[PDB]
Amino acid sequence: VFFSHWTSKYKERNPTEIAYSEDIERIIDSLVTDEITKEEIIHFLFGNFCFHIETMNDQHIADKFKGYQSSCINLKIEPKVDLADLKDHLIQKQQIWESLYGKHLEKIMLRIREKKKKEKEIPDITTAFNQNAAEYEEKYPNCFTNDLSETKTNFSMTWSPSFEKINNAIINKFRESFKSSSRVIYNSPYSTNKARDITNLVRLCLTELSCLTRNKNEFCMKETGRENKTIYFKGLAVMNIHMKKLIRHDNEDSLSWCERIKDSLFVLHNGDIREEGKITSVYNNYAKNPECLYIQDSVLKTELETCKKINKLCNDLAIYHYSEDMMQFSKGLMVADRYMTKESFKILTTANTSMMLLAFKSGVPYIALHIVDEDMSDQFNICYTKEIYSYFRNGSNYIYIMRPQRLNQVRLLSLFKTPSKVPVCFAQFSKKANEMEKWLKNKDIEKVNVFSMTMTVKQILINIVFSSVMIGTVTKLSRMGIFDFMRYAGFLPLSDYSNIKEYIRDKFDPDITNVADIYFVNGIKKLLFRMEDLDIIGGITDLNIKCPITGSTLLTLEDLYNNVYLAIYMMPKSLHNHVHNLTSLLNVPAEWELKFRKELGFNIFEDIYPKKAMFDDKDLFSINGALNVKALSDYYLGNIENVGLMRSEIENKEDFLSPCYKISTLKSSKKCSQSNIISTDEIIECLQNAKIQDIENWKGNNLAIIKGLIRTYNEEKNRLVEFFEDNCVNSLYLVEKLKEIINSGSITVGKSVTSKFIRNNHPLTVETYLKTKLYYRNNVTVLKSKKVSEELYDLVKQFHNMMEIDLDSVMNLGKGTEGKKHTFLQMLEFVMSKAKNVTGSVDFLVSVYLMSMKVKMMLYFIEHTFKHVAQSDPSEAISISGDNKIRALSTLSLDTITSYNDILNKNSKKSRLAFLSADQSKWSASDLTYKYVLAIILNPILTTGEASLMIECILMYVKLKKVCIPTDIFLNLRKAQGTFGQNETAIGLLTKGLTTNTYPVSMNWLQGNLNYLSSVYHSCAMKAYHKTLECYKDCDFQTRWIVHSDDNATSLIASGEVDKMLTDFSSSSLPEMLFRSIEAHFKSFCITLNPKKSYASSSEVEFISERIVNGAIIPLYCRHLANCCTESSHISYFDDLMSLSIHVTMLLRKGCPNEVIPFAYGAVQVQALSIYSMLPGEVNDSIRIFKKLGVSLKSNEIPTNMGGWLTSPIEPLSILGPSSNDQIIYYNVIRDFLNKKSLEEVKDSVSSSSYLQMRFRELKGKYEKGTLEEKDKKMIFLINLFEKATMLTQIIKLPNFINENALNKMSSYKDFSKLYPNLKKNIASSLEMESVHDIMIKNPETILIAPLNDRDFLLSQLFMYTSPKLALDRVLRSKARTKMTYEENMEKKILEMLKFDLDSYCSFKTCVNLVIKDVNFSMLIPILDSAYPCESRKRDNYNFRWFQTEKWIPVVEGSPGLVVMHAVYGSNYIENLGLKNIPLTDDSINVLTSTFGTGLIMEDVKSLVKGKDSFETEAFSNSNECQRLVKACNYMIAAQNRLLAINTCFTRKSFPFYSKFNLGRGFISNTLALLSTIYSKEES
Ligand SMILES: NC(=O)c1ncn([C@@H]2O[C@H](CO)[C@@H](O)[C@H]2O)n1
Ligand SMILES: NC(=O)c1ncn([C@@H]2O[C@H](CO)[C@@H](O)[C@H]2O)n1
């Protein structure tokens, strides 16, 4: 049945003694035990398919039986002759193999009892902390100094004073203040050459060196006095352009000092007088009157007043101005990172009235200068007691100079993210603080101020301000370590943790190097003290305290997790260096591979070797062997049901037996990282044909090769000598030629310039430098990065024997559908036959992970043949239908487990329940890979030959894998070992003294390569754990498991003799024994549990995120909240706004509070405007340009691609998405122009014909009479916008770097430059161009259709070429000429769109149709129009109970089928706006090639000269609007031919080829019920 097709030609091959390697023999020979012998394991493993015999075709059965008989012939075991002997032997095997699980149960019990009596029993957490300090003092002697005057800087490297006086005037004020007599007073850190030197340096730089100026602020010194030069050089010597000092965790003077620091911070912050700015404008637009963001404003008022009060407190406490100053000064420092030298400096001054900094040439060293009045000076001294060198008195003011500080680039970027980080932290902390919220509810907006707060509310505001300041501008690594510790140390309120005290004793790093992190340390210590002191309302009985913000009297448990994980997730990632980060990413496989090699006893030099017969139930790297086979056999028998139907479904859906370019994974523009090296023959021929008479005439690659060999000879002569010896016979001739070239003297040599040699030179120089430097009788390769769409083209050319491209060779074969094609598996076996030949094993090379095309195809085969095996398991959740399925399957697991326990607890003896939420420690490095070949062999889906191919792929992948080091990292490591170390770590042990580029890694299969097979093996291990647990005699067990890669969510319900079973398992609780038994079983199955980020509980489940307790979920919206303010795509403004509006929509879907949404809007808009299109008050705005030109559009009607602001209403944003604002403004303008009231009215008017023509004619008459109106001008502007333009596009697209200078790197362009000569590389051009279009117009399928077969792919790639760290770059690109400017480009563009123009009926009516015809819009808008505000079981509660009722629950009773009021939503992809742009582009390129053909055959094309029929029909199509006429024709024509490529050409030329060949037209969409996955906890 189902026509089982042989999808290979390896039918004669067998898994044993036919493949290249013999490792299967020793794999079988390593599985012999004392009771299972050689013939039994051979019989079971090579004939276990007999259980899958009632759903197999006869050809499949005969092929597998022949494979069994053959494999037993090579494996010297006499096989059985008929199937009956096979079945009898298999029932004997199933009995004796069944007698193993009691032995495994006794083994895991003995392992638990062995692991019990070894670890520790520590009394409490205070003793654990004291012990951890004791071992840290034992490792490093005499730390934890008691003198606080030698710690590090406290207030980061930025110190902002509020200012009272109202850009060169500030610098002149400082210059006139600095001219008084010297009365300086030096300061002690916690109660002096450096202060004197920095005072003299600042005094000189202010008085005498300021007025050779550049860019109005940057100036240097050359013609100065010798005394001034001495002062400047002493200042630069102070600049400098284990010795750690720590403090103990239980200090008290540090607490008192930190309290004084907090009060002085608050009284310093409450002094500002400014009231206008850039950040203030956008945040006040979004939060001062946020009622424009709602539709039903009157039903909630206290939330809006609370948001207004929070914004008023932000305005009062100078939060916006502090964030603005931080952003502008970080931008100025990033600009100051420039080619300016060490003798120049810059004066940074923002709109702050009297704050200055001096920036000099690891980071940027700088000094800050401040003016402080006599009112608040001692509080300034208390604040900055660590960071004040000098101060003096002038008039009624004090002048303060701070210490030099250094900033890195990513640190300046994190300072640049301050206006997005800080105000949302303040808003959510003030929202979550209970007594602050009740005080804000008590007071009215006219009366809130600091002076009328009580002591407690004042203190909690001080703590909130301090926490927000120290969280939003985090720079140093101590806070990173503290927040990582608090991330990993929140597991104490639960039953069993195994990291409550051992984690603190072992892995906690007490790296407290300064003050005011002790506040966070004592906060988390007090929380853990309360937790150890001993739906669910939390804090009403425990009376818990928040860690950062203290925040007493917590209402629910939902706030603690949200605030703590907000502090966790709002931290920057790469505060470590880029080179060090790549070293860390490349170095961990070296450690975890050499550990494996040294433990198993392999040495460095020898081969990988498959089996040392030590893979029998050991601890480090082993499996049980004879148990995994039985577990996989039972898993396959219980999972796979219909082999033939499943195989046919694989071949149909996953597209086996299809051409390779039809695979979407192997077609899209990714990178394959092939190896390409400049040829040694090319190098020696360049050296041979280099002419000494042409020393000045050398240009290009010859000059690059000459400079490379000159540098190689200058650095290392002997290696070049032996390279010439082994690569040329005339080595003396080459040496004397090189000597004559270096004695000519017309070339330039260089010294060791580190990374600059690769930075400012041609790549060929450094490639020939590396190749001539590292010749060690091998071929060192550096991987390039080619596209996969250009390797597939070369592979097809190689497969079809077209090594060199000919124009007639492609055209000979491939006429229509019946031409020559190929399939993916014949391609794959041709690839394997090519790769099995000796080629130096360059095919298997991984560079940081970029795997080759060959390996990509092989893991595509493995992963997509195991994907459908993974799809049939209901307890397995990697094959999900989106992110909804994970949460849905998790909550079905939890509620069915709770239901089964509630059933079981009635009338039973005893019953216990325990959950486990585990993450595995190292899923890739510590794992074994030879356990996977076993899972390949008993696969019943495959036949003989495909399983052998799979085994060949896995064995070659394991045995031949290597990892190559990048060039700059390799050179830096080499020079570091050469000049400092003369030795290296394990990365320099795998590589022979760093004399090799590649180091081998085999048993660590790389992350993400094998995702489905590993999860399948994890689920098999879980089922084997259940089968082991079932063998206990006195108790009844039930286990349920959820499996994702590197994850596990288990639960177990036990009944029976509970006290006896816990005494046997040697633990006091069911979570404790569950943790120990899962650890023992996973250790038996070569899976290493992580003992710190894993816990066993009785009520809480955490799969990947959003932990759920007792059937009720904690929402966890802080991930989206930190994502919106931290992470952005950084490609353009429109795309970043759309991509973060997706995150705003998701945050609205996850149930956030009301007060955070306007601040989130402000955060995304501040980020987008601050990077790309400058926030208002300066150049490159859009509202300023629209106001200057007098454009008819308003401030809130500008589209986002034109620079407009996101002003979508919240419910359409949540339901539709980021395109809803463009759709809404378009629909509003249509309704305003057509003088209609409703969507139904305008649809009924448009649907009747002879209407829009009449409107266009009367609008033309109005334009002729000059009686245009405001709505008419808006209509003309948007009509032109759609004509010259998700619905819309970027319009102004700034071109990237011109890669036409690198198009010679691409093989399709190289083939296009050969069969067509250099006339068309960049009268012969006319006739060649004419030949190109008549061979293009004879084949419309090539340029209209994605490739049906061959002669539709490679010549399409030829013919498509016819006719025409990163944050600093695009913060400077806008302020540059790329030529003209962006602002004048927008000026010229809008001046072009402002005119009426003619022949715009096509764009007008297509805009009208595309806006009106959308089904989701046409159903959503009347529901939003006619929704009653409250009551009738809709609005009852107020605690975030309108972000859940009026959003989406009426939306789902709307689009329909449901009844919920409160649920967390995971939405479908119902809205699609791309059902017309694809045929628009297809018919656009159709008219493009038609117009170019007719313009080539003659000029002035208005009507043709009656050529052929296709030319006549394309003339008729281009006479009118071609797209509009073909849409109007297909409105009633309904041909829909069968696409045989012969009858379509028979029927009619133009219209069938360019209407139906897109497989459809604009048809009606489909609407779903939004897929409410799971409830929230209901409130009423
Ligand atoms: N004139 C130069 O070549 C120059 N100027 C500055 N540096 C760098 O300054 C550091 C030494 O002070 C090294 O990193 C150099 O590369 N080099
Ligand atoms: N980026 C991450 O979130 C990450 N990185 C590593 N790990 C896990 O944490 C362990 C080390 O603590 C590793 O073995 C991984 O399982 N998690």
> DSSP letter string over 1304-1357?
GG-HHHHHHTTSS-TTS---HHHHHHHHHHHHHHS-HHHHHSS--STTSSHHHH
* Nearest atom (ligand 2) to Cα of 920: 16
Report the candidate in 1153, 1233, 1166 with the shortest Cα–Cα distance to residue 1444.
Answer: 1153
Identify the helix (H) or strand (E) that includes residue 1049.
strand 1047-1056
First to last CA, the chain: 58
**Distance separating alpha carbons of residues 219 and 344, to the nearest angstrom:** 6
Q: Where are the alpha helices (DSSP H) in 716-842?
A: 717-727, 731-744, 756-759, 763-773, 788-799, 807-812, 824-835
Helix or strand or coil: residue 1443?
coil
Could you tell me the two tokens for 76? 């010297």
Under 8 Å between Cβ of 96 and 35: yes
Under 8 Å between Cβ of 1054 and 912: yes
* Nearest atom (ligand 2) to Cα of 925: 14
**Distance separating alpha carbons of residues 954 and 866, to the nearest angstrom:** 14
Identify the helix (H) or strand (E) that includes residue 428.
helix 418-432
**Distance separating alpha carbons of residues 958 and 960, to the nearest angstrom:** 6
Cβ neighbours, 10 Å, residue 725: 14
Angle, CA 1232 vertex, CA 1230 and CA 1236 arms, to 5°: 90
CA 460 to chain centre: 37
Side-chain-facing half-sphere of 207: CA atoms under 13 Å = 14
Residue nearest to atom 16 of ligand 2 (CA): 921
Show Cβ contacts of residue 679 under 8 Å, excluding neighbours closer than 6 positions.
none
> What determination technique applies here?
cryo-EM
Under 8 Å between Cβ of 93 and 938: no
Helix axes 1509-1519, 1477-1497, angle to 10 degrees: 120
**Regarding beta strands 1047-1056 and 1035-1044, do their DSSP bridges make them parallel or antiparallel, or are they unpaired?**
antiparallel
Report the candidate in 843, 756, 938 with the shortest Cα–Cα distance to residue 93.
Answer: 938
Q: Is the CB of 1007 under 6 A from ligand 2?
A: no
Under 8 Å between Cβ of 797 and 1353: no
**Distance separating alpha carbons of residues 395 and 393, to the nearest angstrom:** 7
**Distance separating alpha carbons of residues 1095 and 495, to the nearest angstrom:** 8
Helix or strand or coil: residue 1476?
coil
Under 8 Å between Cβ of 33 and 626: yes
Q: 1423: burial class by Cβ within 10 Å (0-12, 13-18, 19+)?
A: middle
Residue whose token pair is 């609780």: 1069
Name residue 591's amino acid. E
Q: Is the CB of 270 under 6 A from ligand 2?
A: no
**Distance separating alpha carbons of residues 1481 and 1558, to the nearest angstrom:** 11
Cβ neighbours, 10 Å, residue 1190: 7
Could you tell me the two tokens for 739? 């000597």
Residue nearest to atom 1 of ligand 2 (CA): 573
* Dist. CA 1088 → ligand 2 center (Å): 13
Under 8 Å between Cβ of 317 and 273: no
Q: Is the CB of 922 under 6 A from ligand 2?
A: yes
Name residue 296's amino acid. Q
**Distance separating alpha carbons of residues 670 and 856, to the nearest angstrom:** 12
Could you tell me the two tokens for 1445? 């009722």
Alpha-carbon separation of residue 325 from 278, 348, 465, 1161 (angstroms): 10, 11, 17, 21
Q: Helix-strand-coil percent breakdown of the chain, rounded to 5?
A: 50, 5, 45
Under 8 Å between Cβ of 80 and 20: no
**Distance separating alpha carbons of residues 1260 and 1267, to the nearest angstrom:** 10
Side-chain-facing half-sphere of 187: CA atoms under 13 Å = 21
The single-letter DSSP state of residue 496 is B
Under 8 Å between Cβ of 1173 and 1133: yes
Cβ neighbours, 10 Å, residue 510: 20
Show Cβ contacts of residue 133 under 8 Å, excluding neighbours closer than 6 positions.
144, 248, 249, 510
**Regarding beta strands 213-214 and 218-220, do their DSSP bridges make them parallel or antiparallel, or are they unpaired?**
antiparallel
**Distance separating alpha carbons of residues 933 and 1071, to the nearest angstrom:** 35
**Distance separating alpha carbons of residues 360 and 342, to the nearest angstrom:** 7
What does residue 357 show for φ and ψ, rounded to 5 degrees?
-135, 145
**Distance separating alpha carbons of residues 435 and 460, to the nearest angstrom:** 9
**Distance separating alpha carbons of residues 1572 and 1580, to the nearest angstrom:** 19
Under 8 Å between Cβ of 422 and 469: yes
Gyration radius (Cα) of the chain, Å: 37
Under 8 Å between Cβ of 869 and 639: yes
**Distance separating alpha carbons of residues 1117 and 1189, to the nearest angstrom:** 42
Under 8 Å between Cβ of 520 and 547: yes
Report the candidate in 1397, 1037, 887, 1469 with the shortest Cα–Cα distance to residue 1216.
Answer: 1469
* Dist. CA 52 → ligand 2 center (Å): 41
The single-letter DSSP state of residue 659 is -
Cβ neighbours, 10 Å, residue 96: 12
Could you tell me the two tokens for 1485? 């390129």
Report the candidate in 720, 704, 699 with the shortest Cα–Cα distance to residue 758.
Answer: 704
Helix axes 319-336, 455-472, angle to 10 degrees: 20
CA 659 to chain centre: 31
**Distance separating alpha carbons of residues 1193 and 1183, to the nearest angstrom:** 10
Q: Is the CB of 972 under 6 A from ligand 2?
A: no
| Partners of residue 1274 on adjacent β-strands | none
Under 8 Å between Cβ of 544 and 527: yes
Angle, CA 1035 vertex, CA 116 and CA 1057 arms, to 5°: 75
Cβ neighbours, 10 Å, residue 1376: 9
> DSSP letter string over 1119-1177?
HHHHHHHH----S-HHHHHHHHHHHHHHHHHTT--GGGHHHHHHHHHHHHHHHTSPPSS
What does residue 918 show for φ and ψ, rounded to 5 degrees?
-115, 145
Alpha-carbon separation of residue 966 from 843, 846, 1007 (angstroms): 17, 11, 19
**Distance separating alpha carbons of residues 391 and 398, to the nearest angstrom:** 7
Report the candidate in 917, 923, 927, 920 with the shortest Cα–Cα distance to residue 1104.
Answer: 917
Under 8 Å between Cβ of 1277 and 1191: yes
Could you tell me the two tokens for 1535? 């041909």
**Distance separating alpha carbons of residues 988 and 974, to the nearest angstrom:** 10
- Annotated domain spans of the chain: 7-98+928-961, 143-246+342-406, 704-777, 1300-1359, 1477-1558
Q: Where are the alpha helices (DSSP H) in 1030-1156?
A: 1058-1065, 1070-1084, 1118-1126, 1133-1149
Cβ neighbours, 10 Å, residue 999: 23
Residue whose token pair is 């490591």: 973
**Distance separating alpha carbons of residues 776 and 345, to the nearest angstrom:** 49
Angle, CA 1216 vertex, CA 1211 and CA 1220 arms, to 5°: 85
Q: 488: burial class by Cβ within 10 Å (0-12, 13-18, 19+)?
A: middle
Show Cβ contacts of residue 732 under 8 Å, excluding neighbours closer than 6 positions.
none
Name residue 1012's amino acid. Y
**Regarding beta strands 998-999 and 397-401, do their DSSP bridges make them parallel or antiparallel, or are they unpaired?**
unpaired
340 alpha carbon, closest ligand: 1
Alpha-carbon separation of residue 1420 from 1216, 1409, 1414 (angstroms): 9, 17, 10
Identify the helix (H) or strand (E) that includes residue 359.
strand 355-359
**Distance separating alpha carbons of residues 280 and 276, to the nearest angstrom:** 6
Under 8 Å between Cβ of 1533 and 1425: no
**Distance separating alpha carbons of residues 1448 and 1038, to the nearest angstrom:** 38
Residue nearest to atom 9 of ligand 2 (CA): 921
How long is the chain?
A: 1580
1089 alpha carbon, closest ligand: 2
Alpha-carbon separation of residue 596 from 532, 591, 601, 957, 984 (angstroms): 39, 9, 8, 18, 19
| Partners of residue 359 on adjacent β-strands | 346, 366
Residue whose token pair is 């006869």: 58
569 alpha carbon, closest ligand: 2
Under 8 Å between Cβ of 129 and 504: yes
Angle, CA 1491 vertex, CA 1485 and CA 1494 arms, to 5°: 140
What does residue 965 show for φ and ψ, rounded to 5 degrees?
-90, 140
* Dist. CA 490 → ligand 2 center (Å): 17
> DSSP letter string over 1227-1261?
HHHHHHHTT---HHHHHHHHHSSSSHHHHHHHHHH
**Distance separating alpha carbons of residues 730 and 1308, to the nearest angstrom:** 38
Alpha-carbon separation of residue 1333 from 730, 1324, 1348 (angstroms): 53, 14, 21
Report the candidate in 635, 1376, 511, 1387 with the shortest Cα–Cα distance to residue 1026.
Answer: 635
Under 8 Å between Cβ of 1213 and 1148: yes
756 alpha carbon, closest ligand: 1
What does residue 1035 show for φ and ψ, rounded to 5 degrees?
-135, 155
Name the residue of 1090, 1092, 1119 whose CB sits within 8 Å of the most ligand 2 atoms, as the mutation to test its pocket.
1090
* Dist. CA 750 → ligand 1 center (Å): 14
Name residue 641's amino acid. E
Under 8 Å between Cβ of 1213 and 1396: no
Residue whose token pair is 């109007």: 1528
Could you tell me the two tokens for 949? 């191919």
Strand order in the sheet with 1112-1113: 1100-1101, 1108-1109, 1112-1113
How many helices (H) and strands (E) in the chain? Answer: 65, 20
* Dist. CA 340 → ligand 1 center (Å): 12
* Dist. CA 1116 → ligand 1 center (Å): 49
> DSSP letter string over 510-577?
----SSSSHHHHHHHHHHHHHHHH-----SSSS----SSS---S---THHHHHHHHHHHHTS-S--S-
**Distance separating alpha carbons of residues 496 and 730, to the nearest angstrom:** 76
Torsion of CA 1415, 1419, 1420, 1425, to 10 degrees: 140
- b/e sequence 868-891, b meaning 16+ C-beta within 10 Å: bbbeebeebbbbeeeebebbbbbb
Angle, CA 212 vertex, CA 206 and CA 215 arms, to 5°: 90
Show Cβ contacts of residue 18 under 8 Å, excluding neighbours closer than 6 positions.
74, 948
Could you tell me the two tokens for 451? 């002076």
Helix axes 518-533, 477-488, angle to 10 degrees: 10
Report the candidate in 163, 130, 413 with the shortest Cα–Cα distance to residue 270.
Answer: 163
Report the candidate in 733, 723, 745, 725 with the shortest Cα–Cα distance to residue 687.
Answer: 733
Report the candidate in 382, 386, 380, 330 with the shortest Cα–Cα distance to residue 513.
Answer: 386
Identify the helix (H) or strand (E) that includes residue 399.
strand 397-401
Q: Is the CB of 921 under 6 A from ligand 2?
A: yes
**Distance separating alpha carbons of residues 425 and 474, to the nearest angstrom:** 13
- Helix/strand/coil (H/E/C) assignment for every residue in 232-284: HHHHHHHHCCCCCCCCCCCCCHHHHHHHHHHHHHHHHHCCCCCCCCCHHHHHH
**Distance separating alpha carbons of residues 477 and 576, to the nearest angstrom:** 9
Angle, CA 960 vertex, CA 955 and CA 965 arms, to 5°: 145
Show Cβ contacts of residue 950 under 8 Å, excluding neighbours closer than 6 positions.
861, 862, 865, 936, 942
